[PDB]
Amino acid sequence: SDRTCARCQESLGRLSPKTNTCRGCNHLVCRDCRIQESNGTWRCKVCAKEIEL
Ligand SMILES: [Zn+2]
Ligand SMILES: [Zn+2]
């Protein structure tokens, strides 16, 4: 409840949790745990990774 990454558990502070929330997990993810998705958004390393289902 302090705004910490959901992959590395790091302080978000000046991260902006308004849009820094994986659209596939709904959790927080710093600008280092996000993978530029070919689409018009981004998905954590756990989502953008190579895996389905
Ligand atoms: Zn995710
Ligand atoms: Zn992170």
Side-chain angles (χ1 to χ4, degrees), residues 35-51:
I35 283 62
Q36 246 273 245
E37 288 252 279
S38 94
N39 72 7
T41 204
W42 61 255
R43 287 240 280 198
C44 75
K45 332 196 97 213
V46 190
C47 279
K49 238 227 190 303
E50 174 181 15
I51 187 171

Side-chain angles (χ1 to χ4, degrees), residues 5 8 30 33:
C5 197
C8 63
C30 67
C33 288

Side-chain angles (χ1 to χ4, degrees), residues 5-10 12 28-34:
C5 197
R7 310 309 330 156
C8 63
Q9 267 247 233
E10 272 182 51
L12 278 267
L28 287 183
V29 240
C30 67
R31 56 182 241 180
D32 201 10
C33 288
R34 350 179 295 163

Side-chain angles (χ1 to χ4, degrees), residues 1-6 9-13 17 26-28:
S1 212
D2 301 67
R3 324 238 207 290
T4 354
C5 197
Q9 267 247 233
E10 272 182 51
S11 30
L12 278 267
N26 327 337
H27 300 317
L28 287 183

Side-chain angles (χ1 to χ4, degrees), residues 13-29:
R14 289 183 232 164
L15 257 267
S16 213
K18 175 141 158 141
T19 129
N20 292 26
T21 298
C22 189
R23 343 210 288 181
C25 293
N26 327 337
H27 300 317
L28 287 183
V29 240

